[PDB]
Design a protein around this ligand. Sequence first.
Ligand code: CL
Ligand code: CL
Ligand code: CL
Ligand code: CL
Lengths: 428, 428, 428
Amino acid sequence: ENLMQVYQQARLSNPELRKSAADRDAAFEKINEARSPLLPQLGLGADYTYSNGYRDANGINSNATSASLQLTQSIFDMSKWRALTLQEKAAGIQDVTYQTDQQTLILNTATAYFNVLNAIDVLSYTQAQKEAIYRQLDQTTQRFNVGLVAITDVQNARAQYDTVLANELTARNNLDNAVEQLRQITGNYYPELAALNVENFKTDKPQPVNALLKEAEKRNLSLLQARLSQDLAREQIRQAQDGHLPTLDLTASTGISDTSYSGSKTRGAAGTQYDDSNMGQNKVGLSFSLPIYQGGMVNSQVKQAQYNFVGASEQLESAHRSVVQTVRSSFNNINASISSINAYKQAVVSAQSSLDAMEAGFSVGTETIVDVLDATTTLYNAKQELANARYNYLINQLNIKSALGTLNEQDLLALNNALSKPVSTNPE
Amino acid sequence: ENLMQVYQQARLSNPELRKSAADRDAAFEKINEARSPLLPQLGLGADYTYSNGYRDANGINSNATSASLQLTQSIFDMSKWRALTLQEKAAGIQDVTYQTDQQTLILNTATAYFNVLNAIDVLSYTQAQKEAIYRQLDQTTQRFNVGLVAITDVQNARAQYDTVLANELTARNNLDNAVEQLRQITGNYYPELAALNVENFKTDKPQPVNALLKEAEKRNLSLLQARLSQDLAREQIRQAQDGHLPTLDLTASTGISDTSYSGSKTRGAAGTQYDDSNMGQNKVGLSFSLPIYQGGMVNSQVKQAQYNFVGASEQLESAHRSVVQTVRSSFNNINASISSINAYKQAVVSAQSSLDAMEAGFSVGTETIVDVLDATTTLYNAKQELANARYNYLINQLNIKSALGTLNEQDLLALNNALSKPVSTNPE
Amino acid sequence: ENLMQVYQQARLSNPELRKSAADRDAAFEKINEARSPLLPQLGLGADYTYSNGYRDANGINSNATSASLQLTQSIFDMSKWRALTLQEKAAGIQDVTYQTDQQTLILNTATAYFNVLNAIDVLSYTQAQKEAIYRQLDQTTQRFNVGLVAITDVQNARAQYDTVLANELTARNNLDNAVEQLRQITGNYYPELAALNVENFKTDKPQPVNALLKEAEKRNLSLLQARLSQDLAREQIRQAQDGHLPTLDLTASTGISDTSYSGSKTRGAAGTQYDDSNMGQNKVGLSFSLPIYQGGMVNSQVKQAQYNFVGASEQLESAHRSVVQTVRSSFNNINASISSINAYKQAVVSAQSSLDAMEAGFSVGTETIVDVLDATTTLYNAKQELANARYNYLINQLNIKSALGTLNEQDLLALNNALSKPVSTNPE
Ligand SMILES: [Cl-]
Ligand SMILES: [Cl-]
Ligand SMILES: [Cl-]
Ligand SMILES: [Cl-]
């Protein structure tokens, strides 16, 4: 299948990304829980007591019950207001981390895809080698029979061939376990997928460095979080400072209050005391609180938040310096990836002409078999190296985009025009 | 000492494991703390105080002393029962982590043990390669003495010999460190270890791909945990919801209360209601509390607990996906391992192109030394590959059992039979 | 600039070390927050309530305001004293974290610097391996047209040359990436860096491994913090069992409160009138509290604390077990590094003499270019390694200082002498 079909059937079925969503959804959900202390609170209370102790002055037994609707409404708290802003501040950061975890999923699917893709290429070339030197191995054990080739050359040929049996083995395994990186970031066994078309290939020169660096130090997801995180630490210098500010609360209630009286000293009593008191209530009130001095606590908390700000500040410096080098580094990687293909292709023909001339030398008996087996292995390496440079450019293209922050569907779309022929993924 | 003796010494002492033990013993003990708020709560407290006539209170100033036994008891506080369940679940997860860690100690002890043995093989084979090159250098010198060998041949030999001395250096340094590795797991230095006896090396395949996948879905330790934690998230919804329910509480007091007055004792129009009041009471009242509208707070948390559940459900698929691509991965690996032993077992056989052919013809003047050297590396470049591949097998059996979660003390009892020959860790 | 200078530029500008500082500075500042509950706690408050009649209250309303000046002063409370002790010990463990971070920068700088120096050497030599084989190619094709026909083996020399272009390619890149690397840590691009002076280069044996070990055990910073943390655990045991102790308090407050009544009850008396009650009071009081039983909470708290202390002890074992294995590695690593310098040192003079003889031979026609290229390749390999070995040495020399925890500017000044000849960080 096409890349944008492996990823397509993977982005909606990705167990990490969705958890990142459920994290953001909960982070946004409590935007209400942080608001709730700024709304009227209402409860229903009901008590029943049984008093029974006795006098050295008072005494007497009683039975009281009660019920009420209490209400509270904050008027000027600020810290309750502050906790609301912080929860808004903190959900934005959690929304960027999701936008970041969206970013990552692209790469990992692409990377795991090409992991499998050039895993074939290696096993494919090891199969191409293991047989191209089976031609050399066969004819030589017949050229030996004519007596033209020594009793020693064949022995060396057989041993070099066996150490290609081993390479082929740990090239199958490399293809298998690569499929087992894709069956995770995707959750699918793909029996075939689109190989990159060899001649349908054009290496476009990466856009200039300083232009990429400016664009990134604005739309990059990593310093955005670090900036929003300096915002969070900043509003916390304010949160600590609220511990000086006064507070104003409103109460309103409607209660009932019954009483009864038991035993002796209650029966046959004088006046109002045994009297069963059955009354209720309607209250409305205002409470005001202002801290004068407390151990220098709220002081300490401010400096603490200030230092925490210096921190989150330097943490941005780390985040900026990181991006500073992610663009340069991958820009060097996409440049070098150009020169690499333009060098390894040159070495494919150079190793090629050297090979066929050795087979011409193996003919007419002017050259050895151990000499042509050097010619073959140095050819197939040049090819293998050529394959890698192609994939490293593709992967470093995404990186240079992803460092900017601008990695999306469209970047992954323009890469379907490059690939074509569907290749097998089974090491049989 | 052998693998079981070395392992069992590690079990006793290993600080990583015993920490992981305390972390579980503490967590289990926390059940008692989490249960405490359900049992009776018995406090006590005295309370002296002194009043003053600041305005109309003039000439009325009190001093009252009071003591009291205070008892509270929960009769249906739902959130408290939930706290106990949550903590039992908390300790359930914590016992499973401790189990994983037991698995980890085993895999580590063996991993580190089969480093020392491999280090010994790279050393052996290097100084075997070293001592062999010295033979062919020796007889080349004395052939050059009698003018049969061009100086380049000797210059070449001595060059290759000098690399091998440099290799014989890094080979000893590795073994030196690999000992120090074994000691920071185990706690002891080992003057000798039982090496792999190659004569009776069994290489029987594994159980089919599916038999493991099944077995590693009932028995596997890291998945069992992702289950237990999705459970914990469920039980946490239940917890959140309990913010709606009413709470009922039994209370009981009994305490003295002695006041006295003195100031403008008595003037007029009142009565001596300022007599030395010596109170005693004996309360046993139970009370009820139910919340109506709490600012939409309790629902946010119900929604959040649900979003957090979806997330805990997400990372259960993630854990499952891990499990597949660890059994499948570890299966492929044990295949390539056995498959590799064969390939490298013949590669060593065919590498006796060095044996005859090269060594033979060199001694009778036929083959050039440079070529005889290239043979006498290829053989040893296969000797190491073989022994290395064998120890890769022995820790791919163990790797599967880790995925199956059945990895235990028994599986070492197997591998201790494979060993036999006591070889020293600090040769020469 | 030089190693010493690059550090001074990074010391003041590094975002990581400066963030560490902020974390330490906050920690120390917290000792004030922790101390604050032991000091007086002054607070002003004000109320207003309107009560309205219901049943037996029907026809009685009230308007009451009050204003007080409250103060709380803890007399005896071990927990509040324990909180302060703990915060200080917290700040201490933070301080050792900071000291550790100071070191990591030093070690990290050196690594990045000698990586730029190593990428120079790797490139500088690749070009000298490229230029040697270009002469090789030129001063061969001159003879090829005329004399000894090289149709089969001048194409091999051309393929040889093409791979050393793809090699110099990668080399060019590993210099850029290694500089951006140095930048991140230092916040500087460097055109010039002081390189190692081979003439000036000596090697000094390390102090005996036992002297080192003893020295580490007494001032290694990881072990120091490990001991501090185990102390924290112990003190947290005491903190738990402070639950058993009583809490003697003091509260002083001077207040003002007045109630004015309204409704169907304005004929009667409380004293001279049953209406106005403007009054104030001055209060001072002690407040004894003592828990007697509470679900066995405190008992389990101490059991947890104790178990948790076992983990701190086990962690202290892990630390020591580590410092042992680190110190002994750092020792092994340095001795092997000297022993390697010596080996590769001879490996060049050997490789030179081999090539010297090969150049001379081929110069007459007694040797082939295939052999003169192989000989040139192995000379630059040895020169590569030798360069690499000395740079490694210096690192292992700092590593050992880092293991016994004494690494500082002094050590970075030491190496400054061995550097001198300034090299460009990109000639192209
Ligand atoms: Cl304050
Ligand atoms: Cl609600
Ligand atoms: Cl208790
Ligand atoms: Cl110790």
